[PDB]
Amino acid sequence: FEESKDRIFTSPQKYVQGRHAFTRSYMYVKKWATKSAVVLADQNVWNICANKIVDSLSQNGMTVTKLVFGGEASLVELDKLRKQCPDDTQVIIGVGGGKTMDSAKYIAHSMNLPSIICPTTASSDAATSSLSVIYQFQKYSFYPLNPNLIFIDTDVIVRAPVRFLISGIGDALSTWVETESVIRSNSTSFAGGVASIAGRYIARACKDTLEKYALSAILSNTRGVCTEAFENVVEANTLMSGLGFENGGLAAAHAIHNGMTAIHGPVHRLMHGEKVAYGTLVQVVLEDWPLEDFNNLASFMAKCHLPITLEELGIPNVTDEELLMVGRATLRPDESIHNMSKKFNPSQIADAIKAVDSYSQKWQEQTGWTERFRLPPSRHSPHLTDIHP
Amino acid sequence: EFEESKDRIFTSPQKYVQGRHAFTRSYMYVKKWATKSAVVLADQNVWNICANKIVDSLSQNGMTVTKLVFGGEASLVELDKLRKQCPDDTQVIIGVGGGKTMDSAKYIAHSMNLPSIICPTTASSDAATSSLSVIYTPDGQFQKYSFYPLNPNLIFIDTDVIVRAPVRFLISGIGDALSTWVETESVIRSNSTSFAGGVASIAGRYIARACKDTLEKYALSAILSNTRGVCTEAFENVVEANTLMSGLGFENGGLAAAHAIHNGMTAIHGPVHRLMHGEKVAYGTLVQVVLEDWPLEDFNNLASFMAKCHLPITLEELGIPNVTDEELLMVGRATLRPDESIHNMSKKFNPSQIADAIKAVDSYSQKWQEQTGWTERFRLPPSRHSPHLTDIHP
Amino acid sequence: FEESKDRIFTSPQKYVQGRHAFTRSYMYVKKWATKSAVVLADQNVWNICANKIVDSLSQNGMTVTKLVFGGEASLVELDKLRKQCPDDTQVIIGVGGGKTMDSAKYIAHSMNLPSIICPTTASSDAATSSLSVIYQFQKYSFYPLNPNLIFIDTDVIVRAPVRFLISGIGDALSTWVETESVIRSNSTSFAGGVASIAGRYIARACKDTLEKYALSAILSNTRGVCTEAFENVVEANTLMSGLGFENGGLAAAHAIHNGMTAIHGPVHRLMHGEKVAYGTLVQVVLEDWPLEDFNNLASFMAKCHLPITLEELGIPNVTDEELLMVGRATLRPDESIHNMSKKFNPSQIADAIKAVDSYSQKWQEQTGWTERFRLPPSRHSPHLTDIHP
Amino acid sequence: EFEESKDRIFTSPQKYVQGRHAFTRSYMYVKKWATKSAVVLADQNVWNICANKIVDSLSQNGMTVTKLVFGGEASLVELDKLRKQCPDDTQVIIGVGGGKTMDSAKYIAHSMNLPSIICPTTASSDAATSSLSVIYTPDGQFQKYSFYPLNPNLIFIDTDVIVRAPVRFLISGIGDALSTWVETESVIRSNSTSFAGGVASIAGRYIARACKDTLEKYALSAILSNTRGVCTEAFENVVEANTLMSGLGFENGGLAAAHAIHNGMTAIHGPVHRLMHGEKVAYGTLVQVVLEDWPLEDFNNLASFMAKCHLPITLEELGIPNVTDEELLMVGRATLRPDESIHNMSKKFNPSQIADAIKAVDSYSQKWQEQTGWTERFRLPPSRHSPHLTDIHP
Ligand SMILES: [K+]
Ligand SMILES: [K+]
Ligand SMILES: [K+]
Ligand SMILES: [K+]
Ligand SMILES: [Zn+2]
Ligand SMILES: [Zn+2]
Ligand SMILES: [Zn+2]
Ligand SMILES: [Zn+2]
Description:
By secondary structure, chain A is an alpha/beta fold. The first copy, chain A, has helices spanning 25-29, 43-59, 75-82, 98-110, 154-159, 162-184, 197-223, 228-246, 252-260, 272-286, 291-303, 310-313, 320-330, 346-367; strands at 7-10, 14-18, 36-42, 63-69, 91-96, 115-119, 131-134, 139-142, 149-153. In chain A, α3 crosses α4. One potassium ion (K) is lined by residues 125, 171, 174-175, 241, 245 of chain C. It is classed as oxidoreductase.
């Protein structure tokens, strides 16, 4: 990470989103490579959609090196993949989830080549970012430039379990809250300098888009239909949230998310956005919003089927000792919570996590809200039941 | 060649860096694309003013810098001559200065398949961040828009250089920035293909809004700041609005009647060659307002804002009070050429409608001046590069 | 009490509130004493938290005279305590409830020494005041100056049964209503002169703070977490309410509260704020607020678990004769109700007490509100059940 | 020495008493701290004007009063000389007059471990109720803030004395009061330690709001009242806002850029010594508005209010139209000293930014004057204690 006093805005060169977009891969990929490309994906993604990209490139005269991602983004495994990339490789194309995407960025960076990131679900805003989580969270690694192209095929996205999209909404929800806290604290942005106004408006676009279309996108996803509303949220979850957080910044929400892993146990079953959503509520308690404002956000998360209580998160019996541990992890020197002008100690973090739980339980009681998020068997498991009405 | 798609597309430079004395921190950013060799292109004026600050920074950090002087003529012949002066091991092309220099840099970089770094020395238009290049005959007449497959890699702005430039330049940039929201909203609401090549993204629409909002809050304070030579945050906000916001806002949205009218106006010639891009675009934006049929009160709100910023809102101020109906019909025909951006609008027009709207703006503005007793007037300077004839500072 | 035509604002010299503040006693106490101090508390408070203050002072070279409050704030008992205070005592520190606090103020005043008041619960706004109730209520006694320091350790406050905090909210709720009535009647303030604008805004701060944070503070208290919301209400219940009422004034609400004691019976089981809350509703009837406005306040009290009916107060069968007695007591010559420009007779007071009961019952019916305050076994007893959702 | 804590702290005088002819009721309040012996300190001017009214009241009630004359010089040498003139059985120190007298009283009282009674004779600043004492070299240059462990015990104001003073004094107090809400909001929103030593209380924030609201409603009516010599409730409201509200509002909140800028300005010297505290603070508040990046319209709303109150909003009015860039950089450096309150702001600055903002305020105000045709102007009197050069009464 390099800090500066200049006003800085960062972004991928291109963001392309559309139904069946993979069948049009070449018209976009050709901007960086017309001769040779590497396509990296785990076997599951190869079985399901990666060949659509390969077919497009091959039909247009390109040589495509198809690599199978082992599933573990370790330095040893990454080095082995790089060694399988032909000398004349012009671009690294990653297709799949976060580990695959981060692996593509790493290999592309190592070979001084452009990268094309193709998410297969809209579960987080990591796609467009120049950073890669280094892990228990340790720190954030910042590449000097953002991936060159974020390529999204919404036919692939709409076919995934709606739990993935919801996790993505959870991650997108934290963007406005965290970025506003960073900007209003006059802290350096995740772009390396003073926050731009443009970035603030993109974070706003994310907020507004979710408010108007989050539920219709969810219903659309569940029904398997690629409505414009669904496409709007895909953009919010990926482009808007991505640019909004990197050009703005992370704060308490994500630090708390990283602190949660310290608990382990059933926590490993939660998706990123599910934890980030709860963490956002925790930041709201730390920011001391009036209870009515907390309820407005908690109710929205509830309507989107996001967990807002310790019970739904699957850790209703977490101990005070465990929470203090989360608090200490949350406050590590390099965590994002330090971007906030307000400062905290571990007990305050622990207290806020419990307060969210009580506030949410009260809201459920007051409104008679009966819907509840039930933690699935594993992190990649679909919802236990169909949330469709 | 421009290529349209059915996908939702957002396009942008990889980095946008803005700060006072930023050129003294050039290597810090340039190193992302080149650590060994770079070409710095600028006309003699810019070399005297600030280009050496960039060179010094890169040199003090172990880089070899090829210093080229833009001949002021952005001709393919001159551009190819420049390209031949670029070492084969050149890693990046750095253009420092105005539109001609910036476009020459993009051309050369594209021709060499190299990344580009654009450093505007004034904030007079939003061309810096775009993948476009305005092509015009040696007479000045607009021909068409050329599109590059990717945007410049880095837009690097030193606000100490910007604040030292004549405020007429900043105002021209405000005029250009003012049309962004109007045109992009028109393209989006007409459901036309964006200048990014696909369906307009929501993000681009919000960046256009950011532009509009920032100008409303800070345009006049930035103008006063520039005039007084002080680099306030307000001034910096407008530099961002004029460059980053207007740039991403228009390319990810689109151009419409305003710019098409600007291109048609150039066909008038005469004193019109002394007008800066934004001065013409501002008038063209009012013309689009007439074509969009906004109620008069709404036209007045925009015209009054332009007047406060010292932008011309009448034919008299533009320097062509005696323009003939036949000349205006000529502008209308030029405005409606097949390749013009006005065709992105769902509402369609004929030459006489363009000509009528140009005159309507003049009458509307004159009425507003009379009703409000507004006495301030834009007076056209000797050349398009000259400062105001008088100091606009209160 | 001394009346004046000047505009007067009165207040303690310092108000300090924080979690574990008692462990930092010396840094604050030293402003008045660095050699010798008396710490007065009943045995229960000594067992639970008073030694934290003693330890801080002793670790900083001070001699601390530890006195045990007998539990009865009688002149005979107070004289005996004064006689136990060393000749070189520099300050009197009272730790505990109202009787202990009033005893400290009395002894400090008698010895011409500064006083430090340390409430162990946030149940009333008496802490910062220069007055002490003289009792059946008889009259208000006004000390020439306010206690010098109000010292609050929120770790102690958050550990107390939430019923105490709620009683405090009940007392704080009357501040804006009563002070506004005093100011708008152009009556002399409880500070001795024309009401200041500053005092009016502090009463407003109290009102606004409760509106935004009362319920979250309650939930926090119940969960045992010291959130900023909880701290905000502690400030509202103590500092804001305290300054807001003394610089403004008392009116019908508190006079009615004093009138209630005349009933005796189960009334002795109610906490101050619980009676004051009902009394505030009674003042609303006397002020003739439209029913909708009455409902807005009654609903708020209900959400905070405050009693709004005669049934909840534990006197559903109070007779008309008994109510007339309350009315006569309420209207005694030195009562605060006389500060109101509108004048009343006993039957009007009785009628208003019954009207509140009917209005509240109608609101409960209309809204289907089922929550109810159940009068505990004694005044210091916790709620019969857990109000946590 | 100032001590910071993690606790939420509110600090205040024990009593604040304000009323017309109040000094004739001195014993009634003074008796709370002393019934046998008291020291009354005031310069000769104040003794002639009202100090004897206080003495008479205490005497007529059996008190022994030590009458001391402030030599006008608030030096430690002179202060210690005064302390030596105070009887050992002195129960309280009463300071009557302006800042120097009030600070001398607080110092002596603190030195003798005795309560203090502060009686301002003008409502020109909010220093009366504070636990602070501005320390400045004999040249006038600000050095640092000294903090007392407790606030003065009683602030006693006789509004008949206040209404008889030149209205320039009240206006200076309005200027000082205007910065309270701006600075305190900045300290609170930056989550910085308050001037009370801990986390800002909600109560202090509302008292700052009370100040802002009262000035908005009654500042001009109080000014007209003072000018006409009538003690209306409106006038009394502003005396409370200038003294109690502004006082508790700033100390329980905090100082920020405005006052730091005021301290930096004093370093300019020249005619700047003729400006009253509030006149400088008002300009400094506008500078903070520029540093906070408020949209121009919001700056205009505050500047227009200051102009209506007859406060200087331009360098011309301040009496330093020709101030040099180097002098302004000097102010910037002084403003940013380690001990300055500007560091409470989350946004950080360098000297050139301070200098730029000072000039920006001047240009913004000049533009507002032009746009609105505002002709009223503050004209700097011969000394900081002189009344206006002309009668501002309509
Ligand atoms: K996010
Ligand atoms: K534009
Ligand atoms: K009360
Ligand atoms: K102030
Ligand atoms: Zn995330
Ligand atoms: Zn343009
Ligand atoms: Zn009470
Ligand atoms: Zn001041």
